[PDB]
Each structure stands twice: as structure tokens, then as C-alpha cells.
Ligand binder design. Structure first.
Ligand SMILES: OC[C@H]1O[C@@H](OC[C@H]2O[C@@H](O)[C@H](O)[C@@H](O)[C@@H]2O)[C@H](O)[C@@H](O)[C@@H]1O
Ligand code: SO3
Length: 417
């Protein structure tokens, strides 16, 4: 007799199903319904979602990554959710970058409800910067400051108290990570570039624009100038997080989840005992030639238009999208709320590192919600990876980067036709 809603999620928190069921238990009691959650392993999440969309067999609600909204929306399989967004405060309730992820680009109606936001900022070793005579305020004020700070960090005599070795100035992945384009995007944007741009109602690559090439080379060249260890370029973001925790890196970019890890003993997967946890700072990405930008991703929630339970599903979207559940689930995931009013909650404001992430959040920017986004990103990342391979050999020239981005741009433009 009790009605059920089926919800698909990805592994967003340490106990994905149990955490999600705790989160919705008050909703279940209030409506007299049961929520049946299925956790889609990141290895299979996108294929399961695509099959639901083509077969018309699947859950009531699914999590969608922000960059997937366009593709699933373009299939015509998602219920409009303008009513839910208006209930939560409408366009003004969201950072504009997050609002853009509610619909296919150009669409009249919203098809996704923002759930949580992934953003990246720079963690740094407060002990290392102090030793190097680098002030964070100045290092993160400008690209020129940022590179000058890395130069000072490379020259510094400072040794980690546990490793007994100097720190790498900057650690970053290259091509062997899920977030190759995301790591590049703030540098593209800060120079005045873009991955794709709309001209005359038509989307084309801008990776080979002068401004994109300026930002890309600024970032990639740090590794050829000695500021990034060759071994970092073999690794993914999770491995670079481990190197920072281990005291091997003065500066590296990640999300807000590292702050919770810094409070958790090493025996439970954290790094509380390590020098890095006791000497931890955060700064936003440095202001570039045209602007300061912070990468945003994360996930939204969508309702399949073949659902038999649309009213109750939209009540659950309002609950998950709304203030109380936004704060609770951002804490569980180590993410930031998608609902901007939640950024003022004391769970963010009481922690200095989370306050800096809130500062970084106001500069947020995301990719356009294109149906063809995955093709764009895939072709961009293949060519950026060839650029990272030249970096690893010290052979990335300006001209070599332009050749690779022209090749990427030709392939992207063909894909978008
Ligand atoms: O798939 C597109 C989707 O990806 C989202 O990130 C997923 C990412 O999460 C990491 O923690 C995990 O280690 C990776 O294996 C996994 O791919 C992203 O934030 C969304 O914006 C994006 O659309
Ligand atoms: O098109 S400009 O805003 O990146």
C-alpha cells in the first residue's frame, strides 16, 4: 500500500546508500512513502542512465552529472522541473554557473534540479609559504604572483618535518585523471578563452583561440619550468591528494572534502596526524588576465518522464534541493550546497578553510550544457593529453600546443555539425 520512489545515485559519500537513506528518512515519514535507492558505481553509471533513457525503463529520479544534463535532456526523456526550481526560489536562488546546468543550452524549460556543487581551490602548506617568504594574499592575487610564489617555493631551503625533504612547489595531474579538462578550464577562462563559443547561434571550438592558448600554456608550462614533479604527471587527483597529505607538495588544487579528511586520523583514511593537516591553507584560483574563475561541476537530479510517481518525485526534488537537506548532504559528500542560500550556514562559516571555498564559489563557472558536450570534452582531453606528453619531455613549445589545439578544434567542429 505504501508508495515507493526509485532513485539512482552515484557514490557521493563514504556509505552512499546508508547516507542517502538517512538523509531522506524524515521525508519518508512526512509523506508516508518509501524511497528505494540504487547506487550506480562510477564505472557503470553513465551506461545505466543511457539505457534507462532509451528503453523507458528505469527509476523515478536519477542523479546526473552537471555536464550530462544537456545530453539526457536532448533525448526528450526528462520531465520539466521549472515548478520545483520556482518553489526553491527560482533563478536568483542559484549561482548563475549552477543555474546554467538546469537545462539544455537554449531550452525554454528546466530539466534538472541542482543537488550539490564540486568546485576546486588551492590548498597550500602555510609553513612552507611562510618559510619561503610568500604571502598567500599576493601569491593568489594574479598569475604573475602565482608563478613568482612557485619560484620562491622552488628556491626555499624549507624541508618537511616528517619527510625531511623539500616540497614540490605545485602538484597537479596531467592526462591520467578524470578531470584533465576541469584542471585546465580555470586557466583557459582566466586568459579570456573558452573551450567552445557560440557565434551566430552556432557552437565552435575556441581551444585554438589566442586567449585559450595563453591560459593553457601558462598552466602546462609550470611543469616544464621545474615547479611540478615529473611523477605527478603519471597520477590522478586522488593520488596527488595522497602526496599532499604525505608532505610532498606545497600547493595543489582539490575540492572541499580534503578539509574533513584533515580532521580524521590516518587509521580511518584521514591525515589529521600529518604536518600537512596542521599547516593547511586554502586560496581561490589566482586572478588571470581577464578574470578570476573557479571550476564548477557536481550533480543535479532529474525526473524521467516515464515515471508513474511524478508528484511525489517532485516533492522529493523540493526536499533534496531545499535548505535543510542541502546543508546535510553537502556535509556527507564534502561538497558545497547547490542552493546558494545554504552557503551562509554556520557549517561553512565556522570553518576558515570552508569560508575560503565559499569565497572561491562566487567566481564559479561551468561549461555550456550542450547535448554534444561529452564528444567536445573527449576530443579536447585527447589533444590536451598529447600536450601533457610533450610537457613530460620538456618539448611543449607554443607552436606545438597551437598545432594540437587546431587538431582538437577541427575534430570538435566536425562533432558539433
Ligand atoms: O560524468 C560527468 C560528471 O562527473 C562528475 O564527477 C564524477 C567524478 O567524481 C570523482 O570523485 C570520481 O573520482 C571520478 O571517478 C568521477 O568521474 C562531475 O563533477 C560532473 O560535473 C560531471 O558532469
Ligand atoms: O565568451 S566569453 O564570456 O568566455
Amino acid at each position: 500500500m505504501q508508495k515507493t520512489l526509485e532513485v539512482w545515485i552515484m557514490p557521493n559519500s563514504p556509505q552512499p546508500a546508508e547516507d542517502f537513506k538517512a538523509l531522506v528518512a524524515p521525508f519518508e515519514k512526512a509523506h508516508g512513502v518509501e524511497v528505494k535507492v540504487t547506487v550506480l558505481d562510477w564505472g557503470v553509471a553513465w551506461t545505466k542512465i543511457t539505457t534507462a533513457a532509451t528503453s523507458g525503463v528505469g527509476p523515478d529520479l536519477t542523479q546526473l552529472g552537471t555536464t550530462a544534463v544537456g545530453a539526457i535532456s536532448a533525448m526528450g526523456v526528462l520531465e520539466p522541473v521549472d515548478d520545483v526550481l520556482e518553489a526553491l526560489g527560482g533563478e536568483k536562488a542559484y549561482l548563475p554557473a549552477v543555474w546554467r546546468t538546469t537545462r539544455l543550452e537554449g531550452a525554454r524549460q528546466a530539466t534538472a534540479v541542482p543537488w550539490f556543487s564540486e568546485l576546486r581551490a588551492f590548498y597550500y602548506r602555510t609553513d612552507a609559504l611562510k618559510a619561503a617568504g610568500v604571502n598567500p594574499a599576493e601569491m593568489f592575487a594574479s598569475w604573475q604572483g602565482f608563478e613568482a610564489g612557485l619560484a620562491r617555493l622552488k628556491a626555499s631551503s624549507f624541508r618537511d618535518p616528517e619527510t625531511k625533504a623539500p616540497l614540490a612547489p605545485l602538484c597537479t595531474p596531467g592526462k591520467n585523471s578524470w578531470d584533465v579538462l576541469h584542471n585546465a578550464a580555470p586557466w583557459i577562462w582566466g586568459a579570456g578563452g573558452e573551450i567552445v563559443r557560440q557565434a551566430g547561434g552556432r557552437w565552435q571550438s575556441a581551444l585554438n583561440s589566442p586567449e585559450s592558448l595563453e591560459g593553457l600554456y601558462f598552466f602546462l608550462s609550470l611543469a616544464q619550468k621545474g615547479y611540478v614533479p615529473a611523477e605527478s604527471l603519471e597520477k590522478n587527483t586522488a593520488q596527488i591528494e595522497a602526496d599532499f597529505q604525505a608532505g610532498k607538495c606545497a600547493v595543489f588544487a582539490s575540492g572541499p572534502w580534503m578539509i574533513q579528511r584533515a580532521q580524521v586520523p590516518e587509521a580511518k583514511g584521514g591525515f589529521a596526524e600529518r604536518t600537512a593537516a596542521k599547516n593547511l591553507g586554502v586560496a581561490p584560483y589566482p586572478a588571470g588576465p581577464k578574470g578570476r574563475y573557479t571550476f564548477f561541476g557536481g550533480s543535479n537530479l532529474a525526473l524521467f518522464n516515464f515515471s508513474k510517481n511524478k508528484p511525489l518525485a517532485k516533492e522529493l526534488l523540493k526536499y533534496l534541493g531545499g535548505p535543510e537537506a542541502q546543508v546535510r548532504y553537502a556535509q556527507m559528500t564534502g561538497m558545497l550546497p547547490a542552493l546558494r542560500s545554504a552557503w551562509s550556514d554556520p557549517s561553512f562559516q565556522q570553518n576558515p578553510l570552508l569560508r575560503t571555498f565559499i569565497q572561491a564559489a562566487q567566481f564559479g563557472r561551468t561549461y555550456p550544457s550542450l547535448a554534444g558536450w561529452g564528444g567536445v570534452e573527449n576530443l579536447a582531453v585527447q589533444h590536451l593529453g598529447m600536450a601533457w606528453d610533450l610537457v613530460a619531455q620538456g618539448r611543449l613549445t607554443r607552436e606545438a600546443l597551437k598545432d594540437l589545439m587546431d587538431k582538437a578544434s577541427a575534430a570538435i567542429n566536425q562533432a558539433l555539425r
